[PDB]
Amino acid sequence: QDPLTINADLQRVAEESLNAAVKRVGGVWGSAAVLEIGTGRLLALAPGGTRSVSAIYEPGSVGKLVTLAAAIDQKKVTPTSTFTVSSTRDMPNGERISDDSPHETQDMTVAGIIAHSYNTGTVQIGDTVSDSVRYEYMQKFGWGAKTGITLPSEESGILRPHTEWGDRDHYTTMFGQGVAVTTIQLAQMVAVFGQKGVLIPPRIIDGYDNGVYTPTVMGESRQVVSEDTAQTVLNIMQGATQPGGTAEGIGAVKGYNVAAKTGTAENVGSSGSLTDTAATFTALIPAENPKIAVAVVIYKENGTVYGSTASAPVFVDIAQFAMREMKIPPSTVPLYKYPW
Ligand SMILES: C[C@@H](O)[C@@H](C=O)[C@@H]1NC(C(=O)O)=C(S[C@@H]2CN[C@H](C(=O)N(C)C)C2)[C@@H]1C
Secondary structure, rough: OOOOOHHHHHHHHHHHHHHHHHHHHOEEEEEEEEEEEEOOEEEEEEOOOOHHHOOEEEOHHHHHHHHHHHHOOOOOOOOOEEEEEEOOEOOOOOOEEEEEOOOOOEEEEHHHHHOOOOHHHHHHHHHOOOOOHHHHHHHOOOOOOOOOOOOOOOOOOOOOHHHHHHHHHHHHHOOOOOOOEEEEHHHHHHHHOOOOOOOOOOOOOOEEEEOOOEEEEOOOOEEOOOOOHHHHHHHHHOOOOOOOOOOOOOOOOOOOOOOEEEEEEEEHHHOOOOOEEEEEEEEEOOOHHHHHEEEEEEEEEOOHHEEEEEHHHHEEEEOOOOOOOHHOOOOOOOOOOOOO
């Protein structure tokens, strides 16, 4: 009978987790999308209606995965390249970049920089490639374009052409500021790293109706980064739940290796200035062999919510249930760790 991809139990878990989290942190709304790795199949989409495809926001640090993937794919850095991180860094073009949390100046590998989500390390990674090349990766990752899912009212998001970027834009676009995305776009993006560098268009329709039940096909996929890059990003993402990672404890799924990135993104409020926050979380599980990709956002007006405390618990509840329901055996290999 059923022509849609939505898993009804998973959908209930999603909605329940999402509602509870929005209320828990005093948010105004939230969204979550779960994609099946390798197929484009949408297993859950919360809330009901079109929010997950029509609400745009600056995603913050989850956007660092695009910057990182570009620099790795262009063979400009490795996971063990070292950069100095610090509270602030004055850049060649005169911009000051801050980490938004004071901390000791120290040297750290690319892997540690991403696990810790340090902006001062991230902008130096981004500076190893040209803006036109970065911008091209952004497009390939699906930003600035509708995903094509058969739901109404989908937004393309906002990706200004790189030729238009000023000194500040050059940097803010490396960590998900000055760009706007949908939740569905964030899920499509992260799945790439569990799909050998391939992006697969998301679908909600499994197949319609002689009047025969003919299933829908996978849709035109595209190589975004190489298989090696995808695997390296997937390894780096496993740093999130390790000691020192931004998702330590709170993003852990008992028995399963998690690959994730958090975000705490400033957003323009009702009265013009940067008063709002989107807490973002993008993850793949099990990390050694991803079966689902998840993106969660919780949006708050006139306050700060953190990717980790607002949105990670939504992913955890979703992910615990999905693994059991999909009969995925617990991880038998260690969580990946690069030296930091
Ligand atoms: C645009 C960037 O400034 C932020 C990206 O979203 C940083 N990334 C995160 C994050 O949620 O991962 C936090 S806040 C979080 C809460 N404490 C940590 C922190 O303050 N760091 C790592 C600087 C991390 C940054 C502001």
